[PDB]
Amino acid sequence: KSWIESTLTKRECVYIIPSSKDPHRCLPGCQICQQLVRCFCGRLVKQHACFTASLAMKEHFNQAIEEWSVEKHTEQSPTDAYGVINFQGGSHSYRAKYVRLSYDTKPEIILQLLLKEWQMELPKLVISVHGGMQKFELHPRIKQLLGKGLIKAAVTTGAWILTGGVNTGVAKHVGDALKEHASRSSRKICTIGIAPWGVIENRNDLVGRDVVAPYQTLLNPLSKLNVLNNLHSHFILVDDGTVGKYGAEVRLRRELEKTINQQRIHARIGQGVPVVALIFEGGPNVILTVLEYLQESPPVPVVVCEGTGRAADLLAYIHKQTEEGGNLPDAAEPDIISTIKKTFNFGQSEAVHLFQTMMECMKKKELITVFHIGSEDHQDIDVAILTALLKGTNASAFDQLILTLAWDRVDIAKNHVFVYGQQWLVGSLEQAMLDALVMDRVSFVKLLIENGVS
């Protein structure tokens, strides 16, 4: 009778079409074995709950009727997996909420899952951390900088950190940041992990309506699948019926970022909630993700952290050696590709196609912000995340002060908005103090009095 029980759905295979070889027909092929078939469902037979598991399961060799779809061969039914993921380990008991969500869930129902059911406050910033998905490592000089810098931007602003949530990617290094640093105001940080329901180790230990589910974080059963992270506060487990596959999380994460960007950041303030991307290691698929962010509808600025590994060093290596309009000086094109040959070993064709993807990223160089870790003076990633939202978007100078006014952060406004050259018009500074008085932003009233407001 609750809201989650009446609205959200789970998905399961009902129409077994195997991916295997028959001894003669329609059925086994290791031995008889009575188990070892492999549906496009992804599970096997005897896993399809009690019914839809029988003989005459779909020369022929399971072809021409294959046509597998999670749209045309899957059954919707209400969710049986919401509650609490009290983690057994790491003496501070970390409570975390979760739900099993369908991939076809409407993007506004997901928003009233977060803002109404889970009673989360509307964020003032959304940080989407992308990068590696293969348990990479970090230089400890880099890790103590990115840890201190990411968590500062989520406390000073009221921010949501969207990770993959699973402990075999960049969600671990966000989780290590939440451990090694401030746990006093970390109750105010919402770190949402949007993962598939086919990757998680102990899914069957998360089954049940509202409950405190005991859940491991260790003991590593050959690491064939992956496990949830301890230091995420909320999990959105995306189900598309299948088991052991990746991909259902991708559209539901991005359409969440669109609808939060559509929401209004404050009652007085008339702007959308800003969304920023963060790129730790990479992979060949992250270069497509960066290019996707730059070209949709007014774009998501990306923040690339060099030194952190594989593809983020490539986007920094291009950003260094190009023209402001994104033009290599016609003599470095083999010099670029041979670096891609070493990092991403595909060879001579797909590295060329990956170079054409990076050249499309360099047309919009005003939206990409590289962070040079410790060899810099423009340090403190906290600044570099927030200043990426001001430059590149081509907003008004009034609109940059007002965005920093909501964040209650004056160091961004005093050093970057109030710079020489900014042409303030008549009623912009006067209306900004009217917002600064009502919102009880005392340090902005001090800043605008020192800039010409009576």
Residue numbers in the entry: 4 to 61, 69 to 464
Sentences from the study reporting this entry:
The transient receptor potential channel TRPM7 is a master regulator of the organismal balance of divalent cations that plays an essential role in embryonic development, immune responses, cell mobility, proliferation, and differentiation. TRPM7 represents a master regulator of the cellular balance of divalent cations and mediates uptake of Zn2+, Mg2+ and Ca2+, which is required for the normal prenatal development and healthy adulthood. The TRPM7 structure represents a tetramer assembled of four identical subunits, with the overall architecture reminiscent of other TRPM channels. Each TRPM7 subunit consists of an intracellular N-terminal domain (NTD, residues 1–789), transmembrane domain (TMD, 839–1146), and cytosolic C-terminal domain (CTD, 1157–1230).
